[PDB]
A = this chain, B = another copy of it.
Amino acid sequence: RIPLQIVRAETELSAEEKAFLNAVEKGDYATVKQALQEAEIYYNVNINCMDPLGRSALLIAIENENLEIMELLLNHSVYVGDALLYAIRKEVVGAVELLLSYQFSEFTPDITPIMLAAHTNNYEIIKLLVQKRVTIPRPHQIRCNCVECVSSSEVDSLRHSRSRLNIYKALASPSLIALSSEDPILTAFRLGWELKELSKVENEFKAEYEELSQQCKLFAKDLLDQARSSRELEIILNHRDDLAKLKVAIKYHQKEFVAQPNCQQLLATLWYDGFPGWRRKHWVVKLLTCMTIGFLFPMLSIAYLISPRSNLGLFIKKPFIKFICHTASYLTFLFMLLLASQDLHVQGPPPTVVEWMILPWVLGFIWGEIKEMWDGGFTEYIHDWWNLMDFAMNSLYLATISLKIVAYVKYNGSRPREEWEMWHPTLIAEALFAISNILSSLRLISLFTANSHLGPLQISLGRMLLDILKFLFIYCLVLLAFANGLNQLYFYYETRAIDEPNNCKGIRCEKQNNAFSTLFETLQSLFWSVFGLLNLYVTNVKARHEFTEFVGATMFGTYNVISLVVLLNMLIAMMNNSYQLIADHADIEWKFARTKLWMSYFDEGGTLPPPFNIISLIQNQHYQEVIRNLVKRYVAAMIRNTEENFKELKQDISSFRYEVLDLL
């Protein structure tokens, strides 16, 4: 038998106090008034007594939305501490008004009335409290190192984090941004960015800051949604303190704001500047138009070079035409790259016709990269993540040019390639040019963003490359482990190349041999074993060491089971899970990426593709009027868009019953 008692005892109520609290709960005004008037004279009932749940008479009256009993208790001067917080959390406007006109707590000490109202996101109570001059303390820098911040963190790191989270919950309230904010959209953008940075910094409190940032982004998107005309939309997007605010939204990674259907419609209308009816056209018509504009890109470039002010000179400045011209230029460059591989004994030969036509494109690519670096800046250049591949391409092309020049000025004779040096400059130049061709042909992935059916796919692939990068670390660890083991076991039986059947040593011979004789060769053997191109007889030695052969073959089999069976299916499961997490947001991400791609063609700089590139207070008032209209519409829409309801209904019915019984 387990005895049950009250381990943490409290002060029980008397019979009269319990009767008074029950009368307050039932809403009987007459009995409560009589009890108060009698407590004034006899002092037999404590009006500030709690209940077994901790609520007092005032808290019970607030929870039941009984304004009459609330006012009756307030007129008798009951304890009122923290009652405003309970009235605000209950989201009852009349109670808040009555408390503005005049121990254990469910609210933390740092909670203030305005902060709690912002937490509740109730426009009425927030506006009530903002009518009075109320103020939220300013949060310090995300990485602030002042004496006050470190002192508060060392004294109490739980109180400090809780206070910061409460302040950022108050500031991130959509109703508190609709009011008391000069620019709600820019405030929402900055607040979302700062909350994302705090989520990055605060690891434990990450989900809350993430959801607050997402709430701010959704607030900005809904504010943009309330626009009802193109004039208002272009006033919003072009406000600067064109498309300045849209560029700011792109800077703060506001994907929901950018992917707005109206914003995307405006961007598409700007994108097809020359063609007014591109939206309603057949597939064959669009294909023929694109092919015709692409085949005429040198004519358009030359017309822009000669006279920019003409029917053909400024025709390339249109964003879609500019994109088509750049794509056609890159396609011709890749076609010449394909032609390049179509005497070969010359040591350091002069460049051929195809290479002489390739050189202008390489120079134009390098000049365009350095011009983008000089104009846009450094951070914008490194934020692209495609300028890395462009830098690799340009560096490899420059190395190819340098090695070609060196081999031309250091060699004159025509010696057959069979007796050339392994590190001959021509060979290194050819290898670097082949790698550069691979990279240049792979550079066409960035054009999948301009397509409707190839954009979300590319976004999904970019997002799934992160799971592959995560799996690559563990795969490489296992690979290094097994390579070290097999090398340690097999390096004793290394044989010279002359002893091999065809003077060939390694796994790239017809008969593979010395697969695990060195660390590098062991790494390559275990890499090629993933694809099955490593034969099983490589785990063999000429000596009759059957135990060593079996141990090596079993190491090989263990590596096969770990990589091909465990790691590969594990990576498949990882990618399968990661893809479903992008299925929903694929369209918004693609629209943001395509918006960036479109905005990249809106500038006057870089108009000519290679190789032709080497040859005012009314605004603020209009924006404020539009913002006022948007705020009104958004407040109305959000207003238009449990047991407490039934409890309020029961309280009303009981109060009406008691007053009818008293009247009759």
Contacts and interface: CB of A to CB of B under 8 A. Distances in A.
Interface string A528-546: 0000100000000000000
A265 to B, nearest CB: 5
Interface string A294-327: 0000000000000000000000000000000000
A280 interface: yes
B452 A203 contact: yes
Contacts of A201: 279-280
A403 interface: no
Contacts of A5: 180
Contacts of A205: 261
A494 interface: no
Contacts of A261: 204-205
Contact of A179 (B4, B176, B180, B268): B4
A38 interface: no
Nearest to A653: B653
Nearest to A660: B660
Contacts of A3: 180
Contacts of A179: 4, 6-8
Interface string A167-190: 000000000100111100000000
Summarize A's interface: helix, strand, loop or mixed. Answer: loop
Highest count of chain B CB atoms <10 Å: which of A179, A201, A532: A179
Contacts of A332: none
A264 interface: yes
Contacts of A280: 201
Nearest to A181: B7
Contacts of A452: 203
A204 B264 contact: yes
Interface residues of A, number: 24
Nearest to A262: B204
Nearest to A265: B204
Contacts of A4: 176, 179-180
Interface in A1-50: 3-8
Contact of A532 (B180, B203, B279, B532): B532
Nearest to A261: B204
Interface string A185-205: 000000000000000010111
B180 A7 contact: yes
Interface in A520-576: 532
Nearest to A9: B179
Nearest to A176: B4
Interface string A260-271: 011011001000
Contacts of A204: 261-262, 264-265, 268
Interface in A490-536: 532
Contacts of A262: 204
Nearest to A205: B261
Interface string A268-303: 100000000001100000000000000000000000
Nearest to A532: B532
A182 B7 contact: yes
Contacts of A176: 4
Nearest to A280: B201
Contacts of A265: 204
Interface string A231-257: 000000000000000000000000000
Nearest to A183: B7
Contacts of A268: 203-204
A6 B180 contact: yes
Contacts of A279: 201, 203
Contacts of A182: 7
Nearest to A179: B6
Nearest to A279: B201
Contacts of A8: 179
Contacts of A180: 3-7
Contacts of A181: 7
A258 to B, nearest CB: 13
Nearest to A649: B649
A586 to B, nearest CB: 14
A204 B179 CA distance: 31
Contacts of A7: 179-182
A642 to B, nearest CB: 15
Nearest to A202: B279
Contacts of A532: 532
Nearest to A184: B7
A511 to B, nearest CB: 15
A190 to B, nearest CB: 13
A229 to B, nearest CB: 16
Interface string A599-639: 00000000000000000000000000000000000000000
Nearest to A576: B576
A280 to B, nearest CB: 6
Contacts of A6: 179-180
Given A5-B180, A6-B179, A8-B179, 18 more contacts: A3-B180, A4-B176, A4-B179, A4-B180, A7-B179, A7-B180, A7-B181, A201-B279, A201-B280, A203-B268, A203-B279, A203-B452, A204-B261, A204-B262, A204-B264, A204-B265, A204-B268, A205-B261
Interface of A: 3-8, 176, 179-182, 201, 203-205, 261-262, 264-265, 268, 279-280, 452, 532
The 10 closest A-B pairs by CB, nearest first: A204-B261, A4-B180, A204-B265, A204-B264, A5-B180, A201-B280, A7-B182, A7-B181, A6-B179, A205-B261
24 contacts: A3-B180, A4-B176, A4-B179, A4-B180, A5-B180, A6-B179, A6-B180, A7-B179, A7-B180, A7-B181, A7-B182, A8-B179, A201-B279, A201-B280, A203-B268, A203-B279, A203-B452, A204-B261, A204-B262, A204-B264, A204-B265, A204-B268, A205-B261, A532-B532
